[PDB]
Amino acid sequence: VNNTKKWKMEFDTRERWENPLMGWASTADPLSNLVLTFSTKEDAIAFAEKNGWSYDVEERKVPKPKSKSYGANFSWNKRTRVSTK
């Protein structure tokens, strides 16, 4: 989860097409590889508003805390018995 730590700003992907000579991915988009890194969401929003970029924000999707129990694999009456180990 070390790649899910900091906020990122990317841009909309523009056209990539085939080079007629070699078959490479040609582009006309200067901002096609521009990925910016921000500590918090509001620093990213402030950097987008400072540069006149129309932005949209997706909120951080955090994994909810699960209830883990090893002995629950070996219950008396519940369906959470494992059939093998």
Partner 1 sequence: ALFVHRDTPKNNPETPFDFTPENYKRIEAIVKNYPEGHKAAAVLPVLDLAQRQNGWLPISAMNKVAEILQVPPMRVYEVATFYTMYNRKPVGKYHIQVCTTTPCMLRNSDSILEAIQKKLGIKVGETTPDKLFTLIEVECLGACVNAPMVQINDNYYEDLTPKDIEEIIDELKAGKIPKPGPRSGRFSCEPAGGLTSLTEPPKGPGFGVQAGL
Partner 2 sequence: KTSFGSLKDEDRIFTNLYGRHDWRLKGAQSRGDWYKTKEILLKGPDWILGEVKTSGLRGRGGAGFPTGLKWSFMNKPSDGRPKYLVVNADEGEPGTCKDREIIRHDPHKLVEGCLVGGRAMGARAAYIYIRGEFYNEASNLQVAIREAYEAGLIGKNACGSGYDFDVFVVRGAGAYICGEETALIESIEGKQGKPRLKPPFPADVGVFGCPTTVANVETVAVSPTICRRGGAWFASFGRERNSGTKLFNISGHVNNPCTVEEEMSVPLKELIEKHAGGVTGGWDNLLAVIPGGSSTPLIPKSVCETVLMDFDALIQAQTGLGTAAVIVMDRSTDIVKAIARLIEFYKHESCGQCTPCREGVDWMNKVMARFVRGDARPAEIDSLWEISKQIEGHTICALGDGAAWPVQGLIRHFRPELEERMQRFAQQHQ
| 82 within 8 A of 73, measured Cβ to Cβ | yes
Nearer to partner 2, 55 or 74 (CB): 74
| 45 within 8 A of 57, measured Cβ to Cβ | yes
Interface pick for partner 2 out of 17, 24, 53, 74 (rule CB under 8 A): 74
Q: What is the distance between the alpha carbons of residues 10 and 53, in angstroms, rounded to a whole number?
A: 11
* Count of Cβ atoms closer than 10 Å to residue 44 Cβ: 19
Question: In the complex, what is the shortest distance from the CB of residue 78 to partner 2, in angstroms, rounded to a whole number?
Answer: 8
Question: In the complex, what is the shortest distance from the CB of residue 69 to partner 2, in angstroms, rounded to a whole number?
Answer: 9
Residues making contact with partner 2 (CB under 8 A): 70-71, 74-77, 81, 83-85
